[PDB]
mmCIF file of all heavy atoms in Angstrom:
data_model
loop_
_atom_site.group_PDB
_atom_site.id
_atom_site.type_symbol
_atom_site.label_atom_id
_atom_site.label_comp_id
_atom_site.label_asym_id
_atom_site.label_seq_id
_atom_site.Cartn_x
_atom_site.Cartn_y
_atom_site.Cartn_z
ATOM 1 N N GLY A 1 5.478 0.435 -5.402
ATOM 2 C CA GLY A 1 4.463 0.891 -4.434
ATOM 3 C C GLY A 1 3.067 0.505 -4.859
ATOM 4 O O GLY A 1 2.778 0.446 -6.052
ATOM 5 N N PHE A 2 2.196 0.238 -3.893
ATOM 6 C CA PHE A 2 0.814 -0.144 -4.198
ATOM 7 C C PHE A 2 -0.077 1.087 -4.275
ATOM 8 O O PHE A 2 0.393 2.213 -4.099
ATOM 9 C CB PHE A 2 0.257 -1.128 -3.149
ATOM 10 C CG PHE A 2 0.963 -2.462 -3.116
ATOM 11 C CD1 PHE A 2 2.163 -2.622 -2.440
ATOM 12 C CD2 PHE A 2 0.413 -3.559 -3.757
ATOM 13 C CE1 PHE A 2 2.798 -3.847 -2.407
ATOM 14 C CE2 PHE A 2 1.046 -4.785 -3.728
ATOM 15 C CZ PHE A 2 2.240 -4.928 -3.051
ATOM 16 N N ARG A 3 -1.350 0.876 -4.554
ATOM 17 C CA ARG A 3 -2.307 1.969 -4.623
ATOM 18 C C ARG A 3 -2.709 2.414 -3.217
ATOM 19 O O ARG A 3 -2.784 1.595 -2.292
ATOM 20 C CB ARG A 3 -3.545 1.560 -5.438
ATOM 21 C CG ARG A 3 -4.343 0.409 -4.825
ATOM 22 C CD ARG A 3 -5.475 -0.065 -5.739
ATOM 23 N NE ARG A 3 -6.605 0.878 -5.794
ATOM 24 C CZ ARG A 3 -7.741 0.653 -6.464
ATOM 25 N NH1 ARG A 3 -7.904 -0.476 -7.143
ATOM 26 N NH2 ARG A 3 -8.709 1.560 -6.455
ATOM 27 N N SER A 4 -2.956 3.702 -3.061
ATOM 28 C CA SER A 4 -3.329 4.267 -1.775
ATOM 29 C C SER A 4 -4.802 3.981 -1.459
ATOM 30 O O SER A 4 -5.654 4.031 -2.350
ATOM 31 C CB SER A 4 -3.088 5.774 -1.785
ATOM 32 O OG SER A 4 -1.764 6.077 -2.192
ATOM 33 N N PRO A 5 -5.124 3.682 -0.190
ATOM 34 C CA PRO A 5 -4.152 3.604 0.893
ATOM 35 C C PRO A 5 -3.519 2.215 0.985
ATOM 36 O O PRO A 5 -4.184 1.201 0.743
ATOM 37 C CB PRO A 5 -4.996 3.883 2.153
ATOM 38 C CG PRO A 5 -6.427 3.968 1.686
ATOM 39 C CD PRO A 5 -6.465 3.406 0.294
ATOM 40 N N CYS A 6 -2.248 2.167 1.328
ATOM 41 C CA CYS A 6 -1.552 0.907 1.447
ATOM 42 C C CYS A 6 -0.795 0.826 2.796
ATOM 43 O O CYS A 6 0.110 1.625 3.045
ATOM 44 C CB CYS A 6 -0.572 0.768 0.277
ATOM 45 S SG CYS A 6 0.150 2.358 -0.273
ATOM 46 N N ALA A 7 -1.174 -0.119 3.676
ATOM 47 C CA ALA A 7 -0.508 -0.273 4.955
ATOM 48 C C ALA A 7 -0.210 -1.744 5.245
ATOM 49 O O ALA A 7 -1.017 -2.615 4.917
ATOM 50 C CB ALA A 7 -1.355 0.328 6.066
ATOM 51 N N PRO A 8 0.950 -2.047 5.854
ATOM 52 C CA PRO A 8 1.957 -1.058 6.180
ATOM 53 C C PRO A 8 2.998 -0.903 5.060
ATOM 54 O O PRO A 8 3.544 0.180 4.853
ATOM 55 C CB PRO A 8 2.602 -1.625 7.446
ATOM 56 C CG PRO A 8 2.372 -3.110 7.393
ATOM 57 C CD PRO A 8 1.329 -3.383 6.324
ATOM 58 N N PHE A 9 3.257 -1.986 4.335
ATOM 59 C CA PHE A 9 4.211 -1.952 3.239
ATOM 60 C C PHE A 9 3.510 -1.534 1.966
ATOM 61 O O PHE A 9 2.441 -2.050 1.639
ATOM 62 C CB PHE A 9 4.885 -3.318 3.026
ATOM 63 C CG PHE A 9 5.289 -4.030 4.289
ATOM 64 C CD1 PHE A 9 4.794 -5.294 4.573
ATOM 65 C CD2 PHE A 9 6.163 -3.438 5.189
ATOM 66 C CE1 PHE A 9 5.162 -5.955 5.729
ATOM 67 C CE2 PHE A 9 6.534 -4.092 6.349
ATOM 68 C CZ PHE A 9 6.032 -5.352 6.619
ATOM 69 N N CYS A 10 4.089 -0.600 1.262
ATOM 70 C CA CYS A 10 3.520 -0.129 0.041
ATOM 71 C C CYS A 10 4.581 -0.103 -1.050
ATOM 72 O O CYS A 10 5.075 0.955 -1.426
ATOM 73 C CB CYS A 10 2.917 1.258 0.243
ATOM 74 S SG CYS A 10 1.899 1.831 -1.149
#
Side-chain angles (χ1 to χ4, degrees):
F2 295 81
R3 63 186 287 184
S4 307
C6 33
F9 318 122
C10 191

